[PDB]
Amino acid sequence: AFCAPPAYLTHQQKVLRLYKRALRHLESWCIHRDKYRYFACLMRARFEEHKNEKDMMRATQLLREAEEEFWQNQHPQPYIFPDSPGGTSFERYECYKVPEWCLDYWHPSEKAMYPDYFSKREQWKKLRMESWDREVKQLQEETSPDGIMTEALPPARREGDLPPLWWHIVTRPRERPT
Amino acid sequence: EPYPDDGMGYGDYPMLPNRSQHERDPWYQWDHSELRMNWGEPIHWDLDMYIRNRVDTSPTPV
Amino acid sequence: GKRLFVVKPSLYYDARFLRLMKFYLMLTGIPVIIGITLVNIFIGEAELAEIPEGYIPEHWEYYKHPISRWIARNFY
Amino acid sequence: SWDKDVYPEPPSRTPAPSPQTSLPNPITYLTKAYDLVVDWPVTLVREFIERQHAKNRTYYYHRQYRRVPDITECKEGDVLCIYEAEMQWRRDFKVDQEIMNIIQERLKACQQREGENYQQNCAKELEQFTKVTKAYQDRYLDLGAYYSARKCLAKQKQRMLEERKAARQ
Amino acid sequence: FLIALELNNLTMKLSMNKANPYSSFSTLLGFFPSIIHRITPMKSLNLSLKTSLTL
Amino acid sequence: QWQEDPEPEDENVYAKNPDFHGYDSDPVVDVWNMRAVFFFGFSIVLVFGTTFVAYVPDYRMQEWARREAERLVKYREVNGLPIMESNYFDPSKIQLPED
Amino acid sequence: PNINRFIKYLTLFLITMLILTSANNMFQLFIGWEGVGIMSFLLIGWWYGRTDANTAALQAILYNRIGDIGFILAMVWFSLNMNSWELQQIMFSNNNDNLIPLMGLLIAATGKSAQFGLHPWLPSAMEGPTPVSALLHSSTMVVAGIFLLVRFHPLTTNNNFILTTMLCLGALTTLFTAICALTQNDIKKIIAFSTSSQLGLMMVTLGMNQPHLAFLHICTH
Amino acid sequence: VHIQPRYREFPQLTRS
Amino acid sequence: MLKIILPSLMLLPLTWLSSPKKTWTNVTSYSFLISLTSLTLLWQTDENYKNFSNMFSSDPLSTPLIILTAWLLPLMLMASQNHLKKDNNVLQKLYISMLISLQILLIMTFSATELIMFYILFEATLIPTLIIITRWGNQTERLNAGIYFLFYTLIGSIPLLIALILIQNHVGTLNLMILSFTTHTLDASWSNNLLWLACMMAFLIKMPLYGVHLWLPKAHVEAPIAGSMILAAILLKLGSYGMIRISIILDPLTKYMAYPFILLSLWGMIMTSSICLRQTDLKSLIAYSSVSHMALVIASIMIQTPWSFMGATMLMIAHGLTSSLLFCLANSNYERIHSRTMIMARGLQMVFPLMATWWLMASLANLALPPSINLMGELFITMSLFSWSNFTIILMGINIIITGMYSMYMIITTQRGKLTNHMINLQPSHTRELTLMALHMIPLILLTTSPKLITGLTM
Amino acid sequence: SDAPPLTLDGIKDRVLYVLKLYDKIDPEKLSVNSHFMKDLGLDSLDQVEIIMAMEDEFGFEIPDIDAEKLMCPQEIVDYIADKKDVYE
Amino acid sequence: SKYKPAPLATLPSTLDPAEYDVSPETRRAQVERLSIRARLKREYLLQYNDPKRVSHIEDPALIRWTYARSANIYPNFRPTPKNSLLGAVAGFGPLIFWYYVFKTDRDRKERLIQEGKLDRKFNISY
Amino acid sequence: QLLREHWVHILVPAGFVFGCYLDRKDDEKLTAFRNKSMLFQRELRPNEEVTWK
Numbered sequence A: 001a002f003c004a005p006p007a008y009l010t011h012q013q014k015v016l017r018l019y020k021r022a023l024r025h026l027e028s029w030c031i032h033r034d035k036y037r038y039f040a041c042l043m044r045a046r047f048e049e050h051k052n053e054k055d056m057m058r059a060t061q062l063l064r065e066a067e068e069e070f071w072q073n074q075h076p077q078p079y080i081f082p083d084s085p086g087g088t089s090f091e092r093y094e095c096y097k098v099p100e101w102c103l104d105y106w107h108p109s110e111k112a113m114y115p116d117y118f119s120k121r122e123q124w125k126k127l128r129m130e131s132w133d134r135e136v137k138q139l140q141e142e143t144s145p146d147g148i149m150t151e152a153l154p155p156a157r158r159e160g161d162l163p164p165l166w167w168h169i170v171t172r173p174r175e176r177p178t
Numbered sequence B: 001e002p003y004p005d006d007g008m009g010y011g012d013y014p015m016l017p018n019r020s021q022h023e024r025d026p027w028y029q030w031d032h033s034e035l036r037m038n039w040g041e042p043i044h045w046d047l048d049m050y051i052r053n054r055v056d057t058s059p060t061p062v
Numbered sequence C: 001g002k003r004l005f006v007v008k009p010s011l012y013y014d015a016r017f018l019r020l021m022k023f024y025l026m027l028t029g030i031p032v033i034i035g036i037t038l039v040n041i042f043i044g045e046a047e048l049a050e051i052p053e054g055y056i057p058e059h060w061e062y063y064k065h066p067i068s069r070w071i072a073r074n075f076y
Numbered sequence D: 001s002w003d004k005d006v007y008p009e010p011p012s013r014t015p016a017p018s019p020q021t022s023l024p025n026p027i028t029y030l031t032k033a034y035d036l037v038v039d040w041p042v043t044l045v046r047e048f049i050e051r052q053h054a055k056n057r058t059y060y061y062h063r064q065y066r067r068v069p070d071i072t073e074c075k076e077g078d079v080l081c082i083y084e085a086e087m088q089w090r091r092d093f094k095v096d097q098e099i100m101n102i103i104q105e106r107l108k109a110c111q112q113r114e115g116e117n118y119q120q121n122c123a124k125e126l127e128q129f130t131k132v133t134k135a136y137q138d139r140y141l142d143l144g145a146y147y148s149a150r151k152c153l154a155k156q157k158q159r160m161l162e163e164r165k166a167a168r169q
Numbered sequence E: 001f002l003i004a005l006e007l008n009n010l011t012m013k014l015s016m017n018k019a020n021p022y023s024s025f026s027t028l029l030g031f032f033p034s035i036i037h038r039i040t041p042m043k044s045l046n047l048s049l050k051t052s053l054t055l
Numbered sequence F: 001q002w003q004e005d006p007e008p009e010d011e012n013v014y015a016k017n018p019d020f021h022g023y024d025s026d027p028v029v030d031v032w033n034m035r036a037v038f039f040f041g042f043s044i045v046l047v048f049g050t051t052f053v054a055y056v057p058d059y060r061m062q063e064w065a066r067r068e069a070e071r072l073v074k075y076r077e078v079n080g081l082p083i084m085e086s087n088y089f090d091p092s093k094i095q096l097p098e099d
Numbered sequence G: 001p002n003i004n005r006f007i008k009y010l011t012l013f014l015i016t017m018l019i020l021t022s023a024n025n026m027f028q029l030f031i032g033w034e035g036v037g038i039m040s041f042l043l044i045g046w047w048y049g050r051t052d053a054n055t056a057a058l059q060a061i062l063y064n065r066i067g068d069i070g071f072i073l074a075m076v077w078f079s080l081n082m083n084s085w086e087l088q089q090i091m092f093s094n095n096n097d098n099l100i101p102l103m104g105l106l107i108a109a110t111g112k113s114a115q116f117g118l119h120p121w122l123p124s125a126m127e128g129p130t131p132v133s134a135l136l137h138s139s140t141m142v143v144a145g146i147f148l149l150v151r152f153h154p155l156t157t158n159n160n161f162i163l164t165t166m167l168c169l170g171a172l173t174t175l176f177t178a179i180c181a182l183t184q185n186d187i188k189k190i191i192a193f194s195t196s197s198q199l200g201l202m203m204v205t206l207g208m209n210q211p212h213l214a215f216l217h218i219c220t221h
Numbered sequence H: 001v002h003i004q005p006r007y008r009e010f011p012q013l014t015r016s
Numbered sequence I: 001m002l003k004i005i006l007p008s009l010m011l012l013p014l015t016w017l018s019s020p021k022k023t024w025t026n027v028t029s030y031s032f033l034i035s036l037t038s039l040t041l042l043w044q045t046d047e048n049y050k051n052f053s054n055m056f057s058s059d060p061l062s063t064p065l066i067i068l069t070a071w072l073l074p075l076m077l078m079a080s081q082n083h084l085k086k087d088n089n090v091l092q093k094l095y096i097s098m099l100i101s102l103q104i105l106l107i108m109t110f111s112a113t114e115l116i117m118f119y120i121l122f123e124a125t126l127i128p129t130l131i132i133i134t135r136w137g138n139q140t141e142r143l144n145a146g147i148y149f150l151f152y153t154l155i156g157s158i159p160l161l162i163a164l165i166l167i168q169n170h171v172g173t174l175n176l177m178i179l180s181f182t183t184h185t186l187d188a189s190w191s192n193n194l195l196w197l198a199c200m201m202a203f204l205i206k207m208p209l210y211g212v213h214l215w216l217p218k219a220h221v222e223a224p225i226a227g228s229m230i231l232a233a234i235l236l237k238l239g240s241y242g243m244i245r246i247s248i249i250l251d252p253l254t255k256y257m258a259y260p261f262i263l264l265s266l267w268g269m270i271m272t273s274s275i276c277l278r279q280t281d282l283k284s285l286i287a288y289s290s291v292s293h294m295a296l297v298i299a300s301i302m303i304q305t306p307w308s309f310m311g312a313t314m315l316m317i318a319h320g321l322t323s324s325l326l327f328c329l330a331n332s333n334y335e336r337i338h339s340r341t342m343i344m345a346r347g348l349q350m351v352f353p354l355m356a357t358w359w360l361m362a363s364l365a366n367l368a369l370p371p372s373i374n375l376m377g378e379l380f381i382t383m384s385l386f387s388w389s390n391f392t393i394i395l396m397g398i399n400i401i402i403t404g405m406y407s408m409y410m411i412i413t414t415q416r417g418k419l420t421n422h423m424i425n426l427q428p429s430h431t432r433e434l435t436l437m438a439l440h441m442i443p444l445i446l447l448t449t450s451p452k453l454i455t456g457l458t459m
Numbered sequence J: 001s002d003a004p005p006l007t008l009d010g011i012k013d014r015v016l017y018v019l020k021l022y023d024k025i026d027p028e029k030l031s032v033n034s035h036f037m038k039d040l041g042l043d044s045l046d047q048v049e050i051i052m053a054m055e056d057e058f059g060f061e062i063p064d065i066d067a068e069k070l071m072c073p074q075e076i077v078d079y080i081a082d083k084k085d086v087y088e
Numbered sequence K: 001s002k003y004k005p006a007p008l009a010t011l012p013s014t015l016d017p018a019e020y021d022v023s024p025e026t027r028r029a030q031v032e033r034l035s036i037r038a039r040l041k042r043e044y045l046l047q048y049n050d051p052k053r054v055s056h057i058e059d060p061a062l063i064r065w066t067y068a069r070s071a072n073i074y075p076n077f078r079p080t081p082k083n084s085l086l087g088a089v090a091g092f093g094p095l096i097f098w099y100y101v102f103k104t105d106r107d108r109k110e111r112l113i114q115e116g117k118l119d120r121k122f123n124i125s126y
Numbered sequence L: 001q002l003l004r005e006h007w008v009h010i011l012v013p014a015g016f017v018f019g020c021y022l023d024r025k026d027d028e029k030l031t032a033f034r035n036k037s038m039l040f041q042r043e044l045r046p047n048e049e050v051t052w053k
Ligand SMILES: CCCCCCCCCCCCCCCCCC(=O)OC[C@H](COP(=O)([O-])OCC[N+](C)(C)C)OC(=O)CCCCCCCCCCCCCCCCC
Pocket: I152, I155, I156, I157, I158, I159, I160, I162, I163, I166, I191, I192, I194, I195, I197, I198, I201, I205
């Protein structure tokens, strides 16, 4: 979530993802903690047995066979955390995650109901005013002349400066807004 | 890749693969978060059929 | 304590519209509903009677409710 | 205000209470409390309302229409008596609609009153309903949205001609 | 009660078993939601857009 | 390029008039148009007209037809007549063709 | 933030369910039917920022709508053949061929009570909050089609083909829903399939000439 | 009504 | 009827003589008074018809349409107040004059006792809708849409004029009551068949019938809000009223010339409901929903059952109100986001709770929620269609299922779901547009409370 | 009432608790800035196991790419605080 | 013991064989796709985080999709025998089918009424 | 000056009065069958000269 995906997944990353998915489906099958610990140690032993491969084409074939075995022996209902996608509490509070720009449309009486918070809100808005031009200049300067670029973004490079495109990250609504 | 010239009004609109929005990565901050699509990328001809409230084409365990 | 701000949309305009709608509706209807209650308590409520011989009733005299009779007499 | 001549109701036959048990009846206790708390103020308010009505009492009459000449004695094209006969027919059509509503309420009241004996004790109501719906189907059925005295007369004439042809043999 | 108790004790027992199509059918809702909710909306909306509106 | 005015951007009308009611830019005409719509829309039309419609009597003679139906059922039941005749029109006063 | 909204929605659902239960004519019972269905839609899509909740509410609406089509067929047949939607004239209609309206009422009850063919809207409807799950999908709404069949049981007793297909459908749906309930992991889904299996038991009981036993099981369940 | 949360031990059960 | 026609006529000098800062207020208040005055036609204490003069009359069918038009005119001014705020005073007064001309000519159209006067007022009402759509429409397709609408309607209406003149020459007066009384049966010949088609196809175009319905979606999309209201809420029902008036003198051959149009209507409401499912434009979706509802009205009017005529009447009034409300909600969203895309604005339930509530009640009226007049119309049309043929219930069921699907798809993709947080130009609500939704929705509740007013001629 | 809020100190204590309970990490050399390979001597499979241990304790899923980015307990604690909006 | 993909159950991106035998041209294709995705994301993020913005963000992809679905169809339609036959059957075959269904039902009902075998016992609200 | 400023407010009521007047003129024009309908053919009361005006 906080890091952008690359152009492709490396073999090492795919092996780690397969290992994590296999252990999650193993806990979904095993349920009991001692049973899962036993069979997860067995799975870790299998991965360590196939760890030291140098040809790397045999390693790719082994990865393909292993994930084929995983798709054959995957749980029909694997355990999903409630906040995870496909879970029960996933996107439950998007109806309550109101974006911050409605306070610009709030009435002066409602603004007067919260004076100090609103004063801090225009302090933050003034900081955004002052930092936007500098961070646009930084983004234009740090862009490579080549067509290669990723979705990663530079940090602030000197004192009194903010990271470019920081507003939508810093001022995002809370996952427990109420 | 455009649709084949069978005279059905498609023209130069690309043949995006027939994958729904469920196969898209849900851990990514898509620009259209409900649609699981970014900004400026081409939109499937059957996006309204392939939205997450609608027909799913995801892989199944069996 | 440790309470946090809750970001909400501008409910002031919706509340103001609802208040104005209710105010105008009650401002016209509470006199109307009070008048209806008073008239059904007190006057009108005409009961069915046979036509006397040689008597030609008025058209509103064929109607039951006092308000209906009044409107039929004054405007029809 | 209603009369048993047009809304017939058999006299109620309730049994006398014969409580074998010694426990008090909460229904009787709550009913006595219900009268003493609710029924007396409600009937007091209604008595005040009724004496106000008697202080300001008015009368209204049920309108009656004389019989205009029927469409059979009525020349075609002469739209004056055409119109008079047609509105008389429409008035009688509405009256027959309400007669049907009266018979249907009679049948429903019979069924609810009899309950489990509705298949036997509602024979008279069902027979009256069947006769009146046969008459209604003979006089008003299949006329269409633009039903009229002329269309009703044409349907009646066709039915009479069919009956006369069937009566020859 | 007794059969499900001994089955739960067998799940407590330390052995993995290969899944069978009966338990796959039972866990995967009898395949009726997946099959029907994929084939009937797809045919309905495909018929709608491809034939009705467009054609 | 042909001379053309730039594309206008809609402004936040609530920024200069927080009590904006949707009708006109300045506050006085806006609030008076709001009051005129409220008073002439709900107050003297949706209530006075509703009362007038509610107290239209004998609308298409449902009540009169009910009373006449009760009278005719009473008449035909105390004199033993059929409730409805099978023929609306008297057969004696109709001259059917000979064939 | 919307606890009052939730409470008002539950109260409106209760009003519509009482209208549906105590209604004398089929139009008023139909008012209760769709009021209950729409408030079910809203209470399933209570967390309206959830795409899965919106999808579950939409498919609940779809299956309840197919039930509404069956109800409309039965209602129209009874209006044409008995001039009213009044249950007294229905009781007088007990002595003829009622195959088409009984088929319509059977389709309506299948849609409302989530029998086989039209079942998965209930386990999808588990997506909403737990009090919604309980009150709507556990005790009151799901037994509305069973309640309608209990209402039309004198018509049901005179048609043997209807009784046999009710019995077969109920047995099939309670078997299938118990099979589904054996291996679920979500506790709400397990007791929801329990609800559907007990509804299949009621549907079997209505396949028999035992409507009062079905209503006793309605209250018990 | 409010009770102290426990990290990995058995919770303190109230009498009621 | 003159006591309603004359002050609506005098609205025009009030419009052109009022101050520019008082024109909207004065015309809106006085048009509300016009609607209040037009409510007096409901005083029908007798089975007889309100024949006011030798030229104008009121009827149990004509009265709800007149009251509906007189009610929509101030609502029309309210909806047109916002998108003309940056517009010239002369053009504003001209637009108000065009709407007032619509309202006047439609009252005369519904109250006319003569079919030739009805035809004159028919395309006399066609002209200002063309002018409104063509001048105040937004996109570049408004000119094409006006051409399509005008020429479908005029190629429909020319054989109607020839049929009317032939009927006048054959009978003698073409007066509606004289025709209704001295109606003569037809010989079921080819001339009578072609005459029937000539007097039917104009109102079938104006309905619109399926196959010839293509002018409606583009006209409704490229039209302004007042044009969308006038079309979807008055003009289709005007074609409805035309068929109901003209069908009396067409016995007996309508019983078999009804066959292709009933099939076209049933399959076309199914087709257009499917298009509503797979439609990417909100105005187009509401337009195709309107096409399906008027197809139901065609089926009822052509099967010619009294219950069907009643269901057509109640569906006329109910669909006019709920379609005007739907176009108003769509136009409010369009004035917010400056776009007509169905999927672009998603999470409006968050920012606009009361407007989402109005959306919900409008959609519930659209999908025939009980005990509304919408469902009374569709249910009685269903009953009459099943009486006509028992296999119509399959098409009715498919139509009702897809109707619920497109209404809830509207609600889900326009209100529910995550909010598009990039739309920072979302003003909270105008009291004007909230009042517009309230004035659309309250008469639906009142007519639900008392449905005897819009039953029509048959009962 | 229920669900007490998290704290930076509590998150750090829980993360160090799990890392101390891990057998491959001796508690005397474990610090909040200790790197998993540079001075802890683990590997990628061990890192994935540590992430799943944090995941099982805190009852929510860290996605795969961020999980592979987290490499010392300080980064793990910072990720937990950023995800659950813990600011003190 | 092999998963069979479907249009409604597609092949997984880990079960497909295309990403195990990778190629340098597929790698650079993924690189260029990420480059375009990053450029579009950077443009959208700049326009989104711009404070001087006082309106929403227009989506040219959405505008293109709406134009392709709505207005491009008739300019880009050419009559072929396949779509001619498809339009003919989809615009007529249901109509003749339901015509024959309703005609047979209505003729049977009319005949049953004419010799009186059909019974309308209480049918008065037709 | 109030009559000069608000003279636009009498045009619609004047049109209403004129419309009522024209309805009255049409009503007295269509009097060819007054007290001549066979449904309402009644003998005139001595205190009246017409059944309706
Ligand atoms: C919007 C729909 C457009 C297409 C359909 C148009 C209407 C089709 C049906 C009516 C026929 C045409 C209009 C005639 C109007 C008068 C009808 C009438 O009085 O009939 C009885 C009359 C007969 O009168 P009669 O009843 O006196 O017959 C004599 C009888 N005896 C001798 C016993 C006394 O029929 C006609 O005269 C019809 C002749 C029509 C010839 C001209 C047709 C031109 C083309 C018309 C359509 C053009 C537009 C569409 C083109 C294609 C677009 C894609």
